[PDB]
Amino acid sequence: GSSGSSGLDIVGIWWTVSNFGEISGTIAIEMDKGAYIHALDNGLFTLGAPHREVDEGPSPPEQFTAVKLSDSRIALKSGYGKYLGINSDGLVVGRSDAIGPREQWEPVFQDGKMALLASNSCFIRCNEAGDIEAKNKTAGEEEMIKIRSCAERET
């Protein structure tokens, strides 16, 4: 050991992005410490169980496909084959094969931090019960997520 890639948090085949321009293609998001955003067939989303190992990749449904559009907006595609669109109530759901307003997203980056902001001018997070909904504009400490990419590197 004593060599590899110091500076960027890389795990297995996923590396943390630096800016929006880097956030492209298949990517994975992490809300909790180890837990990832899971998807449901019924049309809901809950926090999936965390990983026991240190170096491991997320599940097929846990992963999401990012797509650049405009105005620093990217489209997320659930592993099931749908687009992550926020409901009227404010619950992160995925039941549409199109890129609508609710499907549109707007990532942020301040002092290194970052948070997935919905089209309703509000961030998103999950609860202990497993209810993923959009929170107020206020960005809490837990609200901070870790965006990871698994695209072609330059090494």
Cβ-contact 45, 90 below 8 angstroms? no
Experimental method: NMR
Q: Which CATH architecture has domain 1-155?
A: Trefoil (2.80)
Structure tokens at 29: 């998001």
- Cα–Cα separations (whole angstroms), residue 153 to 22, 59, 78: 11, 21, 23
- Cα–Cα separations (whole angstroms), residue 119 to 48, 63, 95, 96: 24, 21, 16, 16
Domains of the chain, residue spans: 1-155
DSSP string covering the chain, please?
A: ---S--SS-EETTEEE-SSGGG--EEEEEE-SSS-BEEE-TTS-EEEPPPPSSSS-PPPTTT-EEEEE-SSS-EEEEETTS-BEEE-SSSBEEE--SS--TTTBEEEE-STT--EEEETTS-BEEE-SSS-EEEPPS---TTT--EEEE-S----
Region class of 130: left (phi > 0), else alpha (psi between -120 and 50), else beta? left
Nearest to 49 by CA among 67, 66, 32: 32
